[PDB]
Write a protein that binds this DNA or RNA. Structure first.
Ligand SMILES: [Zn+2]
Ligand SMILES: [Zn+2]
Ligand SMILES: [Zn+2]
Length: 85
DNA sequence: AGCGTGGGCAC
DNA sequence: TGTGCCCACGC
């Protein structure tokens, strides 16, 4: 509720100053972080990190039940539930 | 499946 | 003033 977004259409607010200014990038279209492999620009450093794994094939997250690996923790999370029948 | 991408947040 | 996870959607 403290920090807020000045643009007309939006009615959003952020507790941390950083999240307000991160959101503002949606409006300005700023994409600060670039992939030195395919040159594609991204809005967030964390999304650039996971994107790079699509190129390298790095998959740090293994399923506890079957061991299948994933580049992202949420992909693994989405996967694990399939072992429930 | 593969994976873009914003919000909540701890640090 | 960032960095970097977890979470959630969406397609
Ligand atoms: Zn806004
Ligand atoms: Zn790339
Ligand atoms: Zn599995």
């Amino acid at each position: 509720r403290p920090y807020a977004c000045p643009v007309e259409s939006c009615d959003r607010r952020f507790s941390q100053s950083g999240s307000l200014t991160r959101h503002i990038r949606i409006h300005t279209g700023q994409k600060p972080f670039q992939c030195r492999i395919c040159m594609r620009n991204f809005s967030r450093s964390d999304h650039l990190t996971t994107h790079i794994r699509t190129h390298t094939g790095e998959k740090p997250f293994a399923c506890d039940i079957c061991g299948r690996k994933f580049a992202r923790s949420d992909e693994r999370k989405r996967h694990t539930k399939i072992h429930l029948r």
